[PDB]
Symmetry: C2
Subunit: 177 residues, 2 copies
């Protein structure tokens, strides 16, 4: 069996791509933006940092961490590797939807309406984060330092907007004329 | 520590909601439609079936399995329970996108174009499954026996369409005028 903390490997190497960071800084990215789409069990971060140092991908000199040439190559190879798209992530709400025959029209309406209100609230939160990012002076483009952050935030916004739209469509079918 | 096979519990109870099924039938739903969004390690199915029988949620009389009144209540309580939306599923491609600063414009174009072609192919596959479902005679509605299947398939189609659209948008930014 392999160590579950290995899931943090490329997240850690990537965070270091632009230059040195303290463990505090790294831990901070996980507590903030990076933890929203690549959650860490915070107990795993320092141990994985140690493993990557010991494997020669990261060095340190507070301790300040940087990529080695080996680390840079390790991150580059992973970025450019093509992998099949993975298996669909288990969405428990969608398993419920699959079994909707076990609910009355009203029960189905209440289940879907609960999910819609929750997803609209999440979308409001993402929209806030997006507006915060976009409050920067430099217009957004491929060359912006913040382009990767823009990519993750716009993906999440589109994702939740699409979930909301789908739920509204189903509610209209549950509430057919 | 709890048993990972417990992830199959409500999938199994739900499959039995409309009446008796053989283990072959249950295994078949997992190999086909249900495995596409709620994947089972096929080694876990029979053991979980046994656990649910022994817990009194399912009975058997080939062995043919049915929900007990307890099982029906167990499925009902889960269906109507409201849970917070869970944490975002780790999408490794999106971690790469977050670190796009480590790629040239051409490298970024090639990465995103690979992902787009793969997602368009998956979408073609979902569209085929959708057309197969919709080849039934009875028009689709809340009251259709197939409404739950429609829900999972349309969700998946919308999901992948939205991913494709997002990728196209990013490719156009990578290829700005
Ligand atoms: C709320 O702020 C953020 C959220 C995300 C991603 C969220 C998700 O994929 O669900 C990414 C960057 C952010 O700054
Ligand atoms: C390809 O056929 C199917 C696919 C799905 C779901 C796929 C997913 O969520 O990725 C559901 C029912 C189907 O019949």
């Amino acid at each position: 069996a392999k160590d579950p903390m290995r899931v943090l490997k490329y997240a850690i190497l990537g965070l270091l791509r632009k230059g040195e960071l303290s463990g505090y800084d790294i831990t901070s990215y996980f507590k903030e933006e990076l933890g929203q789409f690549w959650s860490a069990k915070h107990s795993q971060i320092y141990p994985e940092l140690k493993k990557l140092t010991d494997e020669g991908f990261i060095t340190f000199r507070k301790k300040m961490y940087t990529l080695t040439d080996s680390g840079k190559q390790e991150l580059h190879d992973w970025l450019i590797r093509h992998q099949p798209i993975p298996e669909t992530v288990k969405d428990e709400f969608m398993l419920k939807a699959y079994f909707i025959s076990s609910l009355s029209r009203q029960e189905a309406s209440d289940l879907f309406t609960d999910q819609l209100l929750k997803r609209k609230a999440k979308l409001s939160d993402l929209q806030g984060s997006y507006e915060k990012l976009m409050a920067s002076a430099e217009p957004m483009s491929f060359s912006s330092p913040d382009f990767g952050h823009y990519l993750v935030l716009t993906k999440a916004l589109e994702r939740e907007k699409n979930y909301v739209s789908w739920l509204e469509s189903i509610l209209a079918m549950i509430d057919e004329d």
